[PDB]
Each structure stands twice: as structure tokens, then as C-alpha cells.
Amino acid sequence: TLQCTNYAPKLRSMMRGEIKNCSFNMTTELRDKKQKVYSLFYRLDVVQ
Amino acid sequence: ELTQPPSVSVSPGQTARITCSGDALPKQYAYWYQQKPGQAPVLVIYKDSERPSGIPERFSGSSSGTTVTLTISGVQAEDEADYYCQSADVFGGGTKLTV
Amino acid sequence: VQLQESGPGLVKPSQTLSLTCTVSGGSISSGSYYWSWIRQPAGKGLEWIGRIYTSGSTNYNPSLKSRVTISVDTSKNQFSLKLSSVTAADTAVYYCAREGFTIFGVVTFSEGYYYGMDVWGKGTTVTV
Amino acid sequence: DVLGHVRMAHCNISKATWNETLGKVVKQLRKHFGNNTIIRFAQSSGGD
Ligand SMILES: *[C@@H]1O[C@H](CO)[C@@H](O[C@@H]2O[C@H](CO)[C@@H](O[C@@H]3O[C@H](CO[C@H]4O[C@H](CO)[C@@H](O)[C@H](O)[C@@H]4O)[C@@H](O)[C@H](O[C@H]4O[C@H](CO)[C@@H](O)[C@H](O)[C@@H]4O[C@H]4O[C@H](CO)[C@@H](O)[C@H](O)[C@@H]4O)[C@@H]3O)[C@H](O)[C@H]2NC(C)=O)[C@H](O)[C@H]1NC(C)=O
Ligand SMILES: *[C@@H]1O[C@H](CO)[C@@H](O[C@@H]2O[C@H](CO)[C@@H](O)[C@H](O)[C@H]2NC(C)=O)[C@H](O)[C@H]1NC(C)=O
Ligand SMILES: *[C@@H]1O[C@H](CO)[C@@H](O)[C@H](O)[C@H]1NC(C)=O
Ligand SMILES: *[C@@H]1O[C@H](CO)[C@@H](O)[C@H](O)[C@H]1NC(C)=O
Ligand SMILES: *[C@@H]1O[C@H](CO)[C@@H](O)[C@H](O)[C@H]1NC(C)=O
């Protein structure tokens, strides 16, 4: 499960809402540890 | 859709903090103007804290969520003005700054 | 570019207004610019009236939508504002200004920020 | 992240060249199909 907002909400062009800024609770190289990761996805890569 | 304090006042040299808030702001850029009495308003800030060339370094600002702040560092007597902010639906309103 | 407003300095109550603005040293034709009017009652803050594209497309402030027509004369480089019957609440300064916009990318994709009024005139003061 | 400002990806085709190209395609379709008829080009019908 990924948590997201818009990358640049303050955009009035064709790209508004196209790039999303998402966060994860991601696996680290050690089995017992997690890391918080922020990354960008395109609208076409995700669904609600 | 924005609200503003009716006034702000500072002593010369202090930082004025003029704010605007409302529902459009998390999605839209704020723009700010400095209106001297008897004159058309002067744009001081655009696109959330960017300033036009010719505007003093005193003018800066920031925002979070629904609130935007126009900050004037080192406010001088020459800065007293009617300050306005806008976002859209397509305008806002303003605050009186005395020094 | 300078902007010079003109119109009646006096209108009767329950009487219409026609205001114009000359774009001096400039033109109304193309560019990223939009033309617009804003009202300022002498004791009040600003109220946006409306905007026009050089294409003729318009956007009016809902508060005055039923009362306002905006048009640009691109042969004269004169920006016009027509108001319906005017009352005491309209005793205000009417300003002419040019709103900016820039371009980063494709114009057809609207890739270009937005600026509010960058260039202002002096304002027509109308007694009602 | 994006080091600047967000823009939409796009492709540029010379308009006149494309028109000449279709004219050639239509002329050839007419050789075996529609000698005196109408050829209409349209966008795709749908799917992902
Ligand atoms: C497919 O075909 C389309 C044409 O139909 C073509 O679109 C064109 O894309 C280019 C991409 O750069 C657009 O170019 C931009 O145009 C604006 C317009 O400015 C006009 O007005 C000023 C006023 O003085 C004139 O000086 C200027 O010449 C123009 O008349 C320019 O302002 C843009 O300049 C910036 O980008 C340049 C890129 O190299 C920089 O060199 C330049 O310094 C500017 O960048 C600076 O400012 C940016 C923001 O302020 C900042 O982010 C930068 O870091 C830097 O500081 C630029 O020239 C052009 O208008 C498009 N035309 C249309 C009609 O949309 C597509 O590109 C084409 N596609 C393909 C695949 O080729
Ligand atoms: C695709 O990009 C190329 C450049 O890599 C464009 O080629 C240029 O076109 C102009 C048009 O007058 C010529 O003057 C240049 O000399 C061309 N450059 C080269 C390297 O040949 C080309 O036109 C572009 N194609 C499209 C469809 O826009
Ligand atoms: C990570 O797990 C914690 C556990 O409470 C949760 O609250 C948090 O929102 C998760 N973060 C992400 C980005 O999924
Ligand atoms: C494409 O060809 C048709 C043929 O009638 C012509 O009408 C049209 O204007 C052409 N378009 C261009 C870009 O030349
Ligand atoms: C097909 O079109 C060509 C166009 O010149 C014409 O000469 C030819 O006779 C046509 N064929 C038929 C069967 O009409």
C-alpha cells in the first residue's frame, strides 16, 4: 500500500495531476529493518 | 475564498508578517501586491515567494497547506501599504500595514 | 507599455458606463498576456471585474457577471469595459491592467505559470 | 525529482509532410478499393 499526493499541485498545464509523490514503508537490506521512501510515479502506474 | 487580517503593524526594522488563508491555496500559487495610497498596486511576489526584478530582498514568504505568509524583513516606513493576496475561485483580498 | 484609462467621471444612479484603456507603446494582438479590469471602491480592497484574451474569450467575476461585457479593439489597441446600470455601490476606481504568463513548454499545453496584473494604469474614478 | 519545471512529453511531425504521406496512401488505396469513393481517417476506437 502506497500513500500519495500530487507532485506539483500548483500546476495548470497538461501535466497537472500526472506525477504523484508517493511514500512507502520499504524493505532495507536487513530483515528486521524498514525505511521510509519517497518517490515519483506517473498516474498511469498507480490506482487508488 | 481567502481571508486576511485587517491590519498588521511593525516598528521600523521589524518583520511584517501578512497572511492569507483559504481552500484554494493548497492547489494554487499565491500572488502578492504592495499598494501605496493613490497608486495602482505593485506586484511584489508571484508564484509563491518569487519576486519580480526590481523588488527588494526584504520581500520573501512561504506557505503550507491553506496558509500563505508574506514576510517583509527590515520593514521601513516606505513599506507601509495596502497589501493584497490572490489565488483563484479569481482574486483574494488584503491587509493594512503600518510601520 | 503604459496603460491609460478613460471614461465618464460621473454617471447617474441607474445609468450605464463605458470605459476604455489605451495600450500605449504596446498592442493587443498576441503574446502570453491577458487583458483585465479590477475595481477599487475608495475605502475598500480590490474586486476583480473580468478578463479577456486577445482571442476575444472572456471570464467575468461572478459578482458582476450579469452586469459586465469586455471587449478588445485590436485595430486600435484599446481595451473596453461595458457595465450595466450603475448604482451607489459602484462608486469606485476602475483599473486597466495587463496580466502576464510565461512559457516553459508547449503553448498548446499551457506550460507557463501565470502572473497577476503586472502592468497597471492609473484608474478611472467614477462618481455615480 | 525534476530539476526545473514539469513538461509533457511529445512528438513533432511536419504537418505538410504528413498530409502528403496520407495523400499517397489514399491514392494507393483507391487502386483496389474505393476508386471513386471516400477514404476517412479516424482515431483508434478504444482499449488500454
Ligand atoms: C514541436 O514544435 C513546437 C512548436 O510548435 C515546439 O515548441 C516550442 O518549444 C520550445 C522549447 O524551448 C519553446 O521555447 C520557449 O519559448 C519561450 C517564449 O519566449 C518568447 O518571448 C521572449 C520575450 O523576450 C523571447 O525572448 C523569446 O525568444 C520568445 O519570443 C521562451 O521564453 C523559452 O526560453 C527558455 O527556454 C530556453 C530553452 O533553451 C532557454 O534557453 C531560455 O533561456 C529560457 O529558459 C530560461 O527561463 C526558464 C523559465 O523562465 C528557466 O526554466 C530556464 O532554466 C532558463 O532560465 C523558450 O524559448 C517554444 O515557445 C515552443 N513553441 C511553441 C509554439 O510551443 C516543440 O519544442 C517541438 N517539439 C520538439 C520535439 O522539438
Ligand atoms: C527534428 O530535429 C532535427 C534536428 O536534430 C531538425 O532538423 C533541422 O531542421 C531545420 C529546419 O529548417 C534545419 O534548418 C536544420 O539544419 C535541421 N538540422 C539538421 C541537423 O538537419 C528536424 O527538422 C526536426 N524534425 C521535425 C519533424 O521537427
Ligand atoms: C509505515 O508504518 C506505520 C505504522 O504505523 C504507518 O503509520 C505509516 O503510515 C507507514 N508509512 C508508509 C509510508 O506506508
Ligand atoms: C491536405 O490535403 C488536402 C486535400 O484536399 C487539403 O485540402 C489540405 O489543406 C491539406 N493539408 C495541408 C496541411 O496541406
Ligand atoms: C481508378 O482511378 C484511376 C485514377 O486515374 C482511373 O484512371 C481508373 O480508370 C480508375 N479505375 C476504375 C475501375 O474506375
At residue C96, the 3 state secondary structure works out as strand
Q: Kind of pairing, strands B93-98 and B7-9?
A: parallel
Give CA–CA dist C28/C49, Å, rounded: 19
**Ligand 5 within 6 A of D35 CB?**
yes
Residues whose beta carbon lies within 6 Å of some atom of ligand 4 = D 15-16, 19, 23
C-alpha to C-alpha distances, A19 to A4, A38, A43, B47, B48, nearest whole angstrom: 10, 13, 6, 20, 20
Which residues have C-beta within 8 Å of that of residue C82, sequence separation ≥ 6?
Answer: C16, C17, C18, C19, C68, C69, C70, C71
On the 0-12 / 13-18 / 19+ scale of CB atoms within 10 A, C56 is exposed
Q: % helix / strand / coil in chain A, to the nearest 5?
A: 5, 45, 50
- Any idea where the domains of chain C sit in the sequence? 1-128
Nearest ligand by distance to the CA of C112? 1
Q: Kind of pairing, strands B81-86 and B93-98?
A: antiparallel
Residue holding cell 503593524?
B9
Mutation probe of ligand 3 site: the residue of A23, A25, A26, A38 with most atoms within 8 A of C-beta: A25
* Closest-CA residue to B69 (of B60, B78, B79, B56): B60
Which residues have C-beta within 8 Å of that of residue A2, sequence separation ≥ 6?
Answer: A22, A23, A24, A41, A46
Q: C85: phi > 0 → left, psi -120 to 50 → alpha, else beta; which?
A: beta
